[PDB]
Design a binder for this molecule. Structure first.
Ligand SMILES: NC(=O)c1ccc[n+]([C@@H]2O[C@H](COP(=O)([O-])OP(=O)(O)OC[C@H]3O[C@@H](n4cnc5c(N)ncnc54)[C@H](O)[C@@H]3O)[C@@H](O)[C@H]2O)c1
Ligand SMILES: NC(=O)c1ccc[n+]([C@@H]2O[C@H](COP(=O)([O-])OP(=O)(O)OC[C@H]3O[C@@H](n4cnc5c(N)ncnc54)[C@H](O)[C@@H]3O)[C@@H](O)[C@H]2O)c1
Lengths: 334, 332
């Protein structure tokens, strides 16, 4: 077995904890969160499993010292500027790290000095760090890249992830601009209340893996404007109002389009015959056209991949790794 | 640049050679085949493009000094074991497309232990790969389970075109036989259909930590109504164009893995649609289709080529696809 600690016990951290508890060769050993409502409570009671004898620690360093995990999963924040010190904190204790921070999936191009720092500390303490997740971490990077494994040569990549926002509450409705008018949408993008984090990371992982240079990435966030009435538990989109945000990205080299990613997120796509799914098109020799229907669920997949990568991160060479350096993902035995 | 040798210059070996020649980070250095028609000829002339075909594999490796030899000879461990071991004793790495070499640890543990031991003694590595087994019904399925919390059952289908492969495969699938001859050949063991189901099953099972105690197989002939002529074979009407091979793996009467692999030469002559389909029943459920199918020739050539650097770079021993980093296309 491998011993695991958790640093953020939110939607993802808690799902991950529960998933760890299901695995035959993993052991959940401690959890830390900075929310007053969780500190000192039993993790099993917080997950609805009754008491398991694992308390939420007030301090991450105390958690690692007292329980001795081989690896800590950090599910706190998206940004390198915030998570760098969290990761480095754990590496200084000679433990491995998986994070789902979207920027940590491939940080070498966005923030080279921070990536170099993490990699150096990781090496000094003989341990490894990986950033992963469903997106970035699997569907628009790892899966595409693996698919090119049976190509003789690749000219262009086009991929899309279409999801349904219906299940989520107001917090997500506001982040995707759902229920807004077009003017309110445009003000929301300027203000930062309204898309997707990770396109730059996915692009650069694909490029690194294929040996391509990328010199330009263009991004666009456009309102998906409903022609029909869409009503969930938490929102009512009238015709002409916004049902979600369409975040697209295009990566170029010298005016050649190489990679093209799209991820429209809307409430109730099926009301206009938009099919949820993941779709990958490799143009090359040969051409490949893959569809997964419906889409790999974002919460479940992230919980799954962060858990499933644990043994290979513990076992890997020291340093800042990426999904492209590690063996193929697999479901761990329950 | 990684220097490569080839042992087996058939449909796949030759395509692999040509693919190696296209790559920035590889270099083709020698080729050996046992066909009189090839020996001493230039490999570039044979492909329609200063590398001679050697009569002896050991002489080829000694005289040209590859880091790795690709073996595209035969399907069976009982035949290729000595070919692989022959190259490892020269301190070189090996990739083979032998279907049995994709995952030999459960079918033939003592042969796998022998290859692994010799590989370790000489500080080099061996991998078995290919489109199938090696990617579509093992590596790809397994990767997909990477986003599952738990997996109950796997069902997958590969509708395939046999056109790209040479006489060795044509004979193993009973192509160009009469239907009665095909059915007698499956019973007698002269025709076996698709080789690799057992290997794919055990790779999936090992990766997920499942035990398999029973594998049932069924092989039926696909009878052509039309004339089908490929580079290597001619199927007259009423003759067999391929084999419909299915396999089911169980644990205690619970079906865990189900594979369908209908294979024929030139399916499109009778409007047979190809493709690769995967259904994972679990939490969550996953349902993937690739349409048309990953071409069998191109994908095999591709994957055997693309895995070269990672096999050279790997830890010593008998590896499998599940031990190595993710497959990717090498730059041309
Ligand atoms: N890689 C991916 O594809 C992917 C997918 C899902 C989520 N994510 C990212 O992961 C995080 C989401 O996790 P979530 O959905 O559970 O979020 P969340 O907001 O529900 O959970 C965050 C939890 O961590 C706690 N936390 C935050 N900062 C902390 C700190 N410094 N110390 C201790 N606890 C701290 C919060 O209080 C909360 O309990 C976000 O950064 C999200 O962007 C990425
Ligand atoms: N794993 C996969 O997905 C996959 C796919 C395609 C083929 N294969 C296997 O790879 C092998 C090659 O198939 P192919 O279509 O290229 O066949 P082929 O008949 O076209 O070529 C085989 C070649 O090997 C040569 N050869 C055979 N035995 C030899 C020996 N002992 N020493 C030297 N040369 C020898 C033959 O003369 C010929 O050139 C077969 O066994 C086939 O089943 C695997």
């Amino acid at each position: 077995s491998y011993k695991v600690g958790i640093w953020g016990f939110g939607a993802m951290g808690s799902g991950i904890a529960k998933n760890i508890l299901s695995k035959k060769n993993l052991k959940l050993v401690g959890v830390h969160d900075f929310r007053e409502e969780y500190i000192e409570k039993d993790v099993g009671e917080l997950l609805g499993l009754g008491k398991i004898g694992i308390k939420v620690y007030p301090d991450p360093i105390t958690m690692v010292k007292q329980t001795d995990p081989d690896l800590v999963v950090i599910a706190t924040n998206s940004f390198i500027s915030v998570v760098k010190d969290q990761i480095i904190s754990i590496l200084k204790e000679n433990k491995n790290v998986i994070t789902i921070a979207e920027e940590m999936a491939f940080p070498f191009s966005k923030d080279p000095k921070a990536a170099n720092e993490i990699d150096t500390v990781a090496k000094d303490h003989n341990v490894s760090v990986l950033g992963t997740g469903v997106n970035p971490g699997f569907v628009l990077d790892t899966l595409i890249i693996t698919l090119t494994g049976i190509c003789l040569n690749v000219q262009r990549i086009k991929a899309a992830r279409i999801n349904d926002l219906s299940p989520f509450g107001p917090t997500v409705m506001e982040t995707q601009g759902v229920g807004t008018t077009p003017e309110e949408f445009k003000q929301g993008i300027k203000s930062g209340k309204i898309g997707h984090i990770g396109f730059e990371q996915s692009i650069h992982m694909i490029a690194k893996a294929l040996g391509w240079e990328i010199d330009r990435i263009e991004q666009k966030r456009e309102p998906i404007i409903s022609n029909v009435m869409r009503e969930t538990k938490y929102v009512k989109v009238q015709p002409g109002m916004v049902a979600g945000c369409n975040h697209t990205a295009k990566a170029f080299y010298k005016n050649e389009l190489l990679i093209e990613l799209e991820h429209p997120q809307q409430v109730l796509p099926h009301l206009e015959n938009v099919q949820t799914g993941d779709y990958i098109t490799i143009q090359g020799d040969p051409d490949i056209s893959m569809g997964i229907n419906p889409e790999i669920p974002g919460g479940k997949g992230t919980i799954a991949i962060a858990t499933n990568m644990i043994p290979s991160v513990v076992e890997a060479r020291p340093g800042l790794l990426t999904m492209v350096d590690l063996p193929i993902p697999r479901a761990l035995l329950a």
